[PDB]
Amino acid sequence: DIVMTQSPSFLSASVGDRVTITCRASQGISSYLAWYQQKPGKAPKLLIYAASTLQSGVPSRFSGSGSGTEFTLTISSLQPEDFATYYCQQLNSYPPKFTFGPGTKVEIKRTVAAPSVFIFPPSDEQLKSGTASVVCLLNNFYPREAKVQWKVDNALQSGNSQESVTEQDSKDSTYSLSSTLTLSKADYEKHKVYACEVTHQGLSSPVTKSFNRGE
Amino acid sequence: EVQLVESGGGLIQPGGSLRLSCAASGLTVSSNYMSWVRQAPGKGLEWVSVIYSGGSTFYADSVKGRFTISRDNSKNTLYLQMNSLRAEDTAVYYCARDLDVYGLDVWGQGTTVTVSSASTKGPSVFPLAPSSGGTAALGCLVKDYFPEPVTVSWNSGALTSGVHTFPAVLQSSGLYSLSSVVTVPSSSLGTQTYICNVNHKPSNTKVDKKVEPKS
Amino acid sequence: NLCPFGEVFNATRFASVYAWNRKRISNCVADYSVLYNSASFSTFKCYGVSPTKLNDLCFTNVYADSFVIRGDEVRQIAPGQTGKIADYNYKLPDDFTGCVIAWNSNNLDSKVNYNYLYRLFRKSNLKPFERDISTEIYQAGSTPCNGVEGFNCYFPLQSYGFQPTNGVGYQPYRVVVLSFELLHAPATVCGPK
Ligand SMILES: *[C@@H]1O[C@H](CO)[C@@H](O)[C@H](O)[C@H]1NC(C)=O
């Protein structure tokens, strides 16, 4: 197997920074790499081919470097347009014609902001349909990395909750993450204390927002 | 006029077939490597298929024997016939022009192909009660609908400040769930009416949900 | 009067696959035991003939086609194969009768950034044993290129980025395709016996 890996998965920088996105082939691909830019909704756009050659029509601030197993894509001075996700692809990677990387999303950097944590118990309306979804909301935080651990009667839950993170806000460049812990009304009544524990860079301690079922 | 316009994507049951067309302008498809690359929602780019200038066709093992890439020299069009579709094939399919190491220089806009055995269903809207200092958050859980998208507004559009409508998450039931929260002054919990408007045009459903505070 | 397989297999300089070199073997007694028996080969596949049985078997004409591709393209040197090489560089017929001999040449053709070429673009597939050496700027679009490279106008040859650290699939492989001719003529190539 020949695998392409991109690091970091998410990168934070400000307009004007020199940004460098690393791509690593599990084995040498000597110069058979391309670099693509993709924004949400729009199609991928080829930036670099043969690991160093710049595609016609692409800003000169973009550069591709590296040969063999480790490649870099460098933006000398980050522009507002350059906030997007970047993919390195493997040309002529025999079994698939192309093998793309996991993708590096360049993000607006700003001051660390703690998440505003709220917990919403299931509505009586949803409980009338046999289901109970407890929603935990982390509002307006930075950076993206925020850990949300559900506790049901102080038992850490896993595999019955789903997370969703908004795009970086256009005004304050913060993130919001909702985590929905869904379980049957039966299972819901089988427990009492439903808590959401939030670990984040801006919090000195994990913030636990909890409620007792039926209070 | 140097464009690739694909269509034919849509929502189909598993096992059913679907044909993606890609009208080309500014280049001849019979004189090019023309490839189909797919991208699952929130995932990376996956090579699906390719057709050479000489006519030889290649496919990813993931679609081998089910997909058939072809072209119409007359219409200068690329085609991907996707027979016995599986839910794994749910992705945005980009018609691109392969140039082996010169890269995928020209991409199409991309056509979404959703393959699911989940019958189109309207969303159930549940309130996310504010209860609780400072400013408090309330919201709406838009649960168990298919397919995307679902548009959420507040107070018929009169509330946009502090609103975060999270990306939908695909549940284990094949149906999407989505959080839409808003932060508001706590003093507003006794005066301002907060009704979230959920619109799901696929299921022909509109829901205006009052969000009342808890005790 | 032994056949010169030495100046074909042990040749210092191999040719790029777009311009694959063909050596006409005639009027000699080839010993194929030196090939099928001795040397370490990543691929020695024979079609329509068995490597052991040629040591007493005459042919009117033997064609030794040598070129360089990379590891992932050695599989394309076979009857009924498709890809860059089989379509645009070196096509074998579906009824091919002969042996395809390939070996890794990372230590020979990879230095530091040796350059073998191979045809990227061609308007149609190569006929069996066809050799296209034209450097005509390939026309991908509707506007003719008129011999100047640009967008939609690409040089039809491209250098293999042969670099020592490559993966086995990317490392260079030297290929010699011995094709044996059943012509209605006097036999000029025989086994030693
Ligand atoms: C190439 O040289 C080696 C050196 O021993 C020899 O064994 C081999 O037979 C030579 N190749 C041919 C085709 O004779």
Residue numbers in the entry:
A (entry chain L): 1 to 215
B (entry chain H): 1 to 82, 82A, 82B, 82C, 83 to 129, 134 to 216
C (entry chain A): 334 to 445, 448 to 528
The authors write:
The spike (S) protein is the major surface antigen of SARS-CoV-2. The S protein uses its receptor-binding domain (RBD) to engage the host receptor angiotensin I converting enzyme 2 (ACE2) for viral entry. RBD-targeting antibodies could then neutralize SARS-CoV-2 by blocking ACE2 binding.
We determined four complex crystal structures, CC12.1/RBD, CC12.3/RBD, CC12.1/RBD/CR3022, and CC12.3/RBD/CR3022, at resolutions of 3.20, 2.33, 2.70, and 2.90 Å, respectively. CC12.1 and CC12.3 [median inhibitory concentration (IC50), ~20 ng/ml] were among the top four highly potent neutralizing antibodies in the panel of antibodies assayed against live replicating SARS-CoV-2 virus and pseudovirus. Although CC12.1 and CC12.3 are both encoded by IGHV3-53, CC12.1 uses IGHJ6, IGKV1-9, and IGKJ3, whereas CC12.3 uses IGHJ4, IGKV3-20, and IGKJ1. Among 17 ACE2-binding residues on RBD, 15 and 16 are within the epitopes of CC12.1 and B38, respectively, and 11 are in the epitope of CC12.3. The buried surface area (BSA) from the heavy-chain interaction is quite similar in CC12.1 (723 Å2), CC12.3 (698 Å2), and B38 (713 Å2).
